[model samples]
Each structure stands twice: as C-alpha cells, then as structure tokens.
Target: NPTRVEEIICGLIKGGAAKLQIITDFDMTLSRFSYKGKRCPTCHNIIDNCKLVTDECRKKLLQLKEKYYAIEVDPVLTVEEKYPYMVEWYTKSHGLLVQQALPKAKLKEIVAESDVMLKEGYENFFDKLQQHSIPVFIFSAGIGDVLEEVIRQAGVYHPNVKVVSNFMDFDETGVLKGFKGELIHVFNKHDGALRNTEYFNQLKDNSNIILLGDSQGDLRMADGVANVEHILKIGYLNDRVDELLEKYMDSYDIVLVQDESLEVANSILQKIL
Candidate 1:
C-alpha cells in the first residue's frame, strides 16, 4: 500500500488530532529494536544485560530467553496456545530478577550504560503530539518506570502522554520487591485495558486510534476503547518478516518492515495535525 499510502494519510488528516488517540507498544515499537546491526535491549533486557546483574544471574536469564523466545515467535501456534508460555516466560524471568535484589537506585545508571535507543525521528513524533495536545497512550507489557525514564530522558515526556504498564513496587529502601498490580504480558493487554476503564472513558471523544505495535498481541490493545470511529493499525515488522508478513498485512493497516525511522508515522501525523 506504499503507493496509496497517501490515501490513508488523507484519512488521518481529515480525522485531525481532536478525533485521534495513539495506542502504542513500548519495547520494539517505540524503542529501537536494533542499531547499526547490533540488537538493542528491551526495558527488561536493559537490566538483564547490564552490569548491575551478576554473571550467573545473567546466564540464567539468557537460559529463560532461550527457552521462551522460540515459543513467542513461533508461527505455527495460535495466540491462545502461546498465552501460557508468555506468562511462564515472564514469571521465570521476574523470579530470577527478584533473586538479584535489583535496587531502584541503580536504574538510572543501568539505562545510561545500556545501548538501547529510541527510533530516529522520535522527537518529531512526540513533539507533534504534544503540540497538538493529542493523547498518546503508551500501553506496554514492559516496565513502566523504565519506559517513562527513557521518554523523560529524551525530553519528550509530556502532560498528554499516559502509560499503562507493570510498574515495579519497591520496598521502603527502594529495592525492587514485586510489581504493583496485575501482570501485563503480551497476550493480556485486552484484560489490562478493561482494568483501566476510567482512563479510556475520559478520552471517549478521541475515538479514532492510531495503533502502533510490533507484536500480534498489540493488535488487541484497542479492545476497551469507549468509542471507535476509525482505527489505523500500524505494525513494525522487525523480525521473521518472511513468515509473518502475510499476517501483519492482514491485521495492520500499515506495515513497516525493517524500518528504523519514525518517518512514516511522522508523515501521517503531519497530515493529521
């Protein structure tokens, strides 16, 4: 649809910021999945691959990744079948992390030392949304604190942005104890949305959605929206392109493959705002 991408752009333009809301995934969708041929770490991976964790702990974490990553990306399985595996993956990973006694104080240093990056042109995306007073709802299964810190450091964390993710519950001494609320793994976003009905109810007027995600689980993020006039689903096909392209095209209104810039999204925003 690249050739007629302009038509979609036009639809978004006519909709305008008043009718628009953004629902996006945090990890690969907002953060850079890779940089200069090197893979970038996710919020969880930022800690897993950091010096704050022990070598033995890192090994165990890697083992969990090896065991669960295959099932996560497996093309043959239905999401219903893959749901439990996703939970198992996060549970095991969280258990290992708690054993490490991660201190909340060290998060800033950990992120500073990591190679994680946001996609290029992210400034324009954030600023445009802010300027237009558009609501950007970042719905993630990743760590909320970490995701907020990333955007804050980038100087684009604005008043209009809202985040719904699993935040770390720290002990009195600020050591990571557990997560604060219900778990939000990849497959459970629809359930997560239902849990935050009050937030969406406030934005009922912003009914048209521009949904951005990198996983099939992300496609269900808009399930609890109060009113939906039009939905433009944009998927970032960062891996398994050959196997997943057909599914992505079927589900997403726009699919960006192996693209590292926010150019397409920015272009659409320009049309809209």
Candidate 2:
C-alpha cells in the first residue's frame, strides 16, 4: 500500500501486466495443501490413490514416498548431494508405473474422481492473467497428463496456460508404456530451464517474472530466462513448517507458511492488473 525502496510490490505495480509473466509450480503452489482439515492430493498423489491402480501398487508407492520423500526434504544435505537420490526416487517410481501399463484413457476419470483442488481464488488468478494476455508457464515434476487434466477440469486451462512436466508415453494400445524425455525431479529444475530456453526467449518482451513454487528447486525455474528486470519469487511452505521455515524465508522473496488460499498472490496481482 505504501512505498518502499525498490520493493517487488511497487515494481510489480509499475511494471504492469504486459511486462509480467507467471511461472508457477503445480503441486502445492497453485493447488491447495489442505482442505477441510485433510491433506489435498497433488496430481501424482491422485493417480497413486486412484481406482485404476492396484492395492499392491499403492502399497509400493506409499513405501517409495515414505523412503525418498525424507531425502527430498533433508535440510542437512545441499541440493547437489540430494540430486542423484531424487533421480533415483523418480526412476523407481516411474519403473513401477510403466510395469502397470496404466490406461491413458482413464486419466480423465482419475483426476475427476480425486480430491484435487486448486487453491482458493484460482479462478481470478487464471482469469486475470488470461484477460491481460499474460503467459502462464506451469513447470512441475508431477505427471503432465494428470496435471493437465486437473487444470482442464477446473476450467482454468485458458489459452494463456502452458504446462511442461513428465508426460506419459502411451503405446498404440493407449496404455502408458513409459514417460517421455529426461526425468524432471524437484532438484533438477535448473536443467529443465535450459530445456525450455526457446519458450523463455520468446517472452523476451515480458521480463518481469512472478515465480511461485512449494519447494527450494522452484527458485531456479526462471534461471534460463535471457533477461529479467524485476522478478518476485513466492514460495509456499506447506510442510516441515518448523524446521524448513527459515530456509524458505531466505530463498523465497515471499514465503507463505502453510497458507492454503491464493489470496496473497491474488492481492498482488490485483495491483498489477
């Protein structure tokens, strides 16, 4: 509301929507972390619990989560040290998924039936960006097929929305045989940046970046951008609130501590729009 010395809020307001672009993580940034006192599911989580998967498969997935998720959030290790393990996590998970030969046709039903929800005020978030022709790049490590369905079903898959993630490779039978391209784990987002260089370069006119993420890797989402005049890094700290609190605050320009709604981001967008 008031002025400060070159603060992001003032920069955003002055830059206007034309010079701005939205790059956000899918899992818990735009999506709700918890709803009605229950943890909400990410795209991968939705598929994990879906009817299409067997109980044995679900059990293995749970085991994978319990084991590798700890390594993912281990604060003691640097990202460099944890990188290989993250790839290993994705490898084992993807290996198991390929063996299941999941039907691509069932993805829509799986997402529709799951308890996946975008954060509160998402309508305005996506709508406002679309209204201004601001490009929204959803860069995630979650399953692309499932994430796309989630956004499409929510009615927020506007013309301005584009997603880049681990997409499933379907066989002629329309069953998922494997994932396409290099693995996109939470730790290797900077590499993902290089992969999307053309997309970022295309938006050379839009140099003001508003990045949103739920993990430390998200901070690097805009790394390969050719030019950036004013950038705001907003991070959602949905878990490990106590231990990971300070680290998030240090990395993210605005660290949202367990907040479920998109109210803060929306308020900022209101100023720009």
Candidate 3:
C-alpha cells in the first residue's frame, strides 16, 4: 500500500497545482478536535454556546448532542441505520435555534468570543493553495455561516475558497428563520456532493485531489468530482482511536491519529507546490 501511495504522490507531483484541488471538512478536520485535553467547538457548537441563545435552549441542544453524537460515532451502526437519527438531530436542534430568533449581526462576535481553533499550520495550507489559485471546496455538514466566519477571522477565507453547508436564512429584520438548503447530515454527503455538480464541472481540469476529513462519511466528499486522475484522502482520527483506527487506515491514504494539526498535509504540499 505504501508503494501505491508512493505512486499516487508521484502522480500528484507530476500533476502539481494546476491539476489539483482540495475537498475538505470543516468541523474536526480543519478545526482542532481538542486542545490541552479539552474538546474544541464545532460551528454548531459555536452557536449552541453563544450568548445569543438562552440557557434553556442550550440545555435542549445538549440533550440532542448526547443522543445523536453517540449514534454519530458508533462503530457498530451503518450509515443507513444512523441516517434518520442524524436528520432528526439536526431538525430538533435547528428548530430550537430558530425559536431563539438569533440575530445575524451577532454571528461575528459570537465566533470571535468562542473557543474554536483551526489546525496548526493552517495558514501555510490555505496560503499555499490560494497562491497557486487551486480551488478549495469546503463541503461541511456544519453551519456554513459560522464556518465562513472562522476562516474569515483567521484571514484565510480567500478568493479560491468556497463553502457549501447548512447556511442560516435570515428574515427582513436579520433574525434566524431556518436553514436554506436540503438537509446535509453526515451520512448524506454523497448526495450533497452530487448536488453541487456546477462547482465540480468548472474544475474539470483539476483532476487530482487532496481530501481532508475526520469522519468515515468524509470519504464520499469527492464523489461529485467531474474527473479524477488521482486522489489522496487524509483522515484525522481524532477520537476513539482504538475503535476507529482500522477503518480509517483501510479508507484514508493518510490517517492522523489525534494529531490536531496540518503538518503532515503541509509537508505533502511542500513537495507538490
């Protein structure tokens, strides 16, 4: 497999930036899973813990996380079995968020005040891709508006970066109404990928790809790619390492266990760029 991996790298180096693009996850992939032995916040968690929401709603959201997060990381259940549960989780939580009538104007301050952190060496990663004009498609199940703000606050939400996720719809008064698109839960990313054919079609020449994700569902992130000469999947195995290691190793070309950094991917980029 290392030999095959070497060949892929060879193909990537030969193809270089012109033929390359990035498909990555937002939560726990680009963002750190934990720091100092404490878990970091996801985009949803940012809103969940923000001051804009009442403590009662926060407790309600916590109850949803407790139920669905167990199913989300369960090694035993198939994506098929967990599909409906995820949809249910998102619906309940999003409903609670909507009830709060969260103001759009508070989003920036909420993100800035939160404990979210991008992976180390992220600057090098984003800057390098931007410098070369390689397209970056951030296909996330997390909140799009919050995800965009995280990168923007970090100053890496550049011209080449695009995000597709469950974006909030604001009313005339700029308060939360509901989500804009079809539900994109963890198990349904393949469906979401295919739905974004317009974005993929434009990057037909970018036949080589580097994909980064933390969940097993992340493997399907590139399913919509118009053409692929080569693809190297990098999975970040952030939690339950003993249980998920084998699966991650079998699927991802590179598996980083509890790494919480982009150093490995950055090294590969150095070779290709």
Candidate 4:
C-alpha cells in the first residue's frame, strides 16, 4: 500500500475489527501459484497431476489447459462472450474427472502428494482473523472438496473461514459422479455474489470489506455485501504484470506485483485487528 492509500486505510482500522469482513479468492490468491521457480498446483491441478489419473487422462487434461487457460485470463474479451467457454472448460474438465472414478477417500491422499503451497505468512493471516472473530469468506472457482482439504492439511481451516465453491458429488460407493449445484467458473463470480447474498446480508453490521483476489473477475467478489462503509480491494499480480498492472491498479486499492507473500494483506489485517 502507498502513503496516501495508507491514510485511506486509517479510517478502516479506526472502525475496529468488529465492523470488518474478508472476501477472497482461493487459487493464486491465498494459494501460491509458483514457488522456487516451479509452478505450484491448484486444487484442480492436484487431482489432474495425481497418480490416479491415467496417461490417457493426463494427455487430454493437457489439451484443456492449453485451450482454456488462454480464455481464462483474456481481458480483451467481454465476460458475457467468455461465459459459455468457461462452462465448457469446467464441464469438460468435470467429465474427465468423472471418468477417473475418483474416490472421495483418495482426495486427502492426492492432495498430500501434490506440490501445493499457500502464500507466505498464511498462518498469521488465518490465526489473526480467527482470534478477532473476523468473518473470512473464501469464494473459490476451484473444487470445494479439494480446496477444503488443502487448507485442512495446512491446519488453517479455522471456524472463521467460510467457503463457497463447486463441490464434488459422489455415489454411495464414494466414487466421483459429478459436481453439485451451480457452477462457479471464472468470470461468473458476480453471479456468485448475488447467489450468495444472504451470507453478506446477514452480516450487515460488519460492512467493511477487505477483498483479495488475483483474477479480473475477483473485483466483484464483494458486490453482495450490504451497508459497506469501506471496501478495500487488494489484487495479487502473479503473471503478465506488464500487460495487466494498470488495469489491476485501476480496480484494486493495492496491487501487489509478482508478490508471493501475504505481507501486504497481513499488514492491513494488523491495522484492523
């Protein structure tokens, strides 16, 4: 955060922790996208890069990644135009996962073996929110079952952390059948806001929002919140910084470029707590 921006945050802190809440994205936001010059895996990638998936499955998964990862971050394209492609990306990925006959029992094992990492200072981040009873809403476009397991394994799945994501559906045999309920792919986060209005509406008293995310769609994550007095948007710029920095700074109050640490968000948390 810059000097003048720090002045703006002073009022948010003065309001105290009770009036605050957090809305954040999961992958590449709270979770590290890369570490030690190696790319880290997201929840979906955890399963995609697992042993359970066959050679044939992995080949197709690569094709999807090549095709959709491009569309996922294309700013020149309008969200309305890109929406169906996202559904297509998610739907096809879901079908590939289903064919693997993934066991819910295997999720823990899969996540354990994958190279997943949270941003640095994650422990203090979750701990401070829990201690202050500040609500932390983790709204992810990734797999709910996998996202939960990732945090659970990291020992930060605190009572204060509430999540809304696309969860897996399994048959009685515990084999993956399909995804449950509405899809929440990237670019559809605004719809997720209105769909989950009650979560924010019920906490109308805690109207100050600290929104964190790494996607173009992430800016809308706090749209459903009512009575918002101060909503500060913090964006993490992980890749393509030269292309996206201006737009990110335009949309976010603080843009952490190529930053893999939670120092900035943790600093803001310190002020509020």
TM-score of each: 0.94, 0.95, 0.97, 0.96
Kindly indicate the candidate among 2 and 4 with the higher TM-score. Answer: 4
Clashes of 4: 0
> How many steric clashes does model 2 contain?
0
Badly placed stretches (over 4 Å) of model 2 are 1-6
- Global Cα RMSD, each model: 1.7, 1.8, 1.1, 1.4
| Cα-lDDT of candidate 2 | 0.88
Residue-level lDDT of model 3, residues 121-222, one tens digit each, is: 999999998999989999999999999999999999999999999999999999999999798888888999999999999999999999999888899999
Which stretch of 10 consecutive residues in model 1 shows the poorest summed lDDT? 1-10
Candidate 4 residue lDDT tens string, 89-201? 99998999999999999999999889999999999999998999999999999999999999999999999899899999999999999999999977778889999988888
User: Which candidate model has the greater TM-score, 2 or 3?
Assistant: 3
The deviation in Å at residue 119 for candidate 4 is 0.8
Model 1 steric clash pairs = none
Best-to-worst ranking by TM-score:
3, 4, 2, 1
TM-score of 2: 0.95
Candidate 2 structure quality by residue, lDDT tens digits, 66-101: 998898778799878988988888888888888888
lDDT of 1 by residue, 1-273 (tens): 664555655666788988899999999898998998899889998889888789999999898899899898787899889989998888888888887888998888888778889999999999999999999999999988888888888899999999989898889888888888899998888898788888889998987889999988899899889998777889999988999899999888889998888898898788788
